[PDB]
Amino acid sequence: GANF
Amino acid sequence: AIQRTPKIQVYSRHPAENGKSNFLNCYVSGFHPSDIEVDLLKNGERIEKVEHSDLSFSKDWSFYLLYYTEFTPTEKDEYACRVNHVTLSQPKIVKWDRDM
Amino acid sequence: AGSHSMRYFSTSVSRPGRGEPRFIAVGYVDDTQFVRFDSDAASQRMEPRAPWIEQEGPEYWDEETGKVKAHSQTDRENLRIALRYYNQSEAGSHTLQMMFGCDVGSDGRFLRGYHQYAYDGKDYIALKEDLRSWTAADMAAQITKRKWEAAHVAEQQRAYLEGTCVDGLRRYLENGKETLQRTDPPKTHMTHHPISDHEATLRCWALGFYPAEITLTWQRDGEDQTQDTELVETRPAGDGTFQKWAAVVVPSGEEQRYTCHVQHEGLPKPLTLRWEP
Ligand SMILES: [Zn+2]
Ligand SMILES: [Zn+2]
């Protein structure tokens, strides 16, 4: 779900 | 990029009895990256109806796969697993030893 | 069993010049796989891989399929971000792996949670054991850690891992109870293989056990032979059980100095085997  | 070379085990599901149908397994593990080619061989020749498990990986992030096929071992037929991977200069062939 | 785990795993592999990255995800309860998704497959759905998961309603398959597809898009984006962080070219193929899950005790209570990433086979960022902060492995991962800290990703993950993840694991253990709760002990035996007139191999076998966790060790005169045992990786039989063997090379006539020791949750008592022709 979270981007780098 | 860490590269890890595959470990290979070739073995039957059940203790081999000449004449009785069984399953021939080739378990490939510990490799990275994930692209790999695996063939089961009967007397040097690629076996056709070979299935394999879904790509998974271990705690150290290295991949593992099980390839398998039904087979009926005999006294003289040789079986092997042939594996190619980027870490190998040449395809590695591992012969089935019914005691391992 | 005394404790249980649910684990989800995903792998994305970029394919420069050959379209979007290959994405493969699998879910496990203990050592039993129960779902998969493969971006190469025609259905574009999450698919069952154990019979008991088919007890889940159609809403489950729709919702999980949407989430796994959204995750494949996130990891497509993250592979692009990684190229920039590491100043790598668009010509090479790279790998992004993720794992998350939870452990619960046999009393049904949360034990531990996990949420981690690896890039090209090396740790990138991982949720720490207290589920409150991140271990970031290198300079690029600190950029991610900063962003995740400001967005409170750890609190979102902690709430999923202690809540929905535990609830799902407990439901699966109920629906798959007959198979998931078994602790089938190994069937054991020993073989003997002369190598020469000076040496022979004793091999200790464990067959047909579940779950996969097991300890096989050789002793000589009551002392661990860890420095001399050939020990193969625990391997699947293909029928839901596992196999393992351990071997030692033994000077001729000294077989009775050696004992094989087997520990497995399915055993009432640890086993001790001797060569007894
Ligand atoms: Zn249990
Ligand atoms: Zn001699």
Residue numbers in the entry:
A (entry chain C): 2 to 5
B (entry chain B): 0 to 99
C (entry chain A): 0 to 276
Question: What did the paper state?
Answer:
We herein demonstrate that human leukocyte antigen (HLA)-A∗24:02 and HLA-C∗14:02 proteins, which are known to bind conventional long peptides, also have the potential to bind N-myristoylated short lipopeptides. These HLA class I molecules shared a serine at position 9 (Ser9) with Mamu-B∗098, in contrast to most MHC class I molecules that harbor a larger amino acid residue, such as tyrosine, at this position. Thus, we concluded that the structural flexibility of the large B pocket of HLA-A∗2402 and HLA-C∗1402 primarily accounted for their previously unrecognized capacity to bind such chemically distinct ligands as conventional peptides and N-myristoylated lipopeptides.
The synthetic lipopeptide, N-myristoylated Gly-Ala-Asn-Phe (Myr-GANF; note that the C-terminal 3 amino acid residues were identical to the peptide used above), was also able to promote HLA-A∗24:02 complex formation, as evidenced by the increased signal at an elution volume of 15 ml (indicated with an arrow), which raised the possibility that the Myr-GANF lipopeptide may function as a potent ligand for HLA-A∗24:02. To establish the molecular basis underlying the potential of HLA-A∗24:02 to bind lipopeptides and determine how the amino acid residue at position 9 may impact ligand binding, the soluble form of HLA-A∗24:02 complexed with the Myr-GANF lipopeptide was prepared, and its crystal structure was determined. The overall structure of the Myr-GANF–bound HLA-A∗24:02 complex was almost indistinguishable from those of other HLA class I molecules, characterized by semisymmetrical α1 and α2 domains forming an antiparallel β-sheet topped by semiparallel α-helices. Electron density corresponding to the Myr-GANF lipopeptide was observed in the antigen-binding groove, located between α1 and α2 helices on top of the β-sheet, which provided structural evidence that the lipopeptide served as an authentic ligand for HLA-A∗24:02. The myristoyl group of Myr-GANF fitted in the B pocket of HLA-A∗24:02 in a sigmoid-shaped configuration, which contrasted with the U-shaped packing pattern observed for Mamu-B∗098.
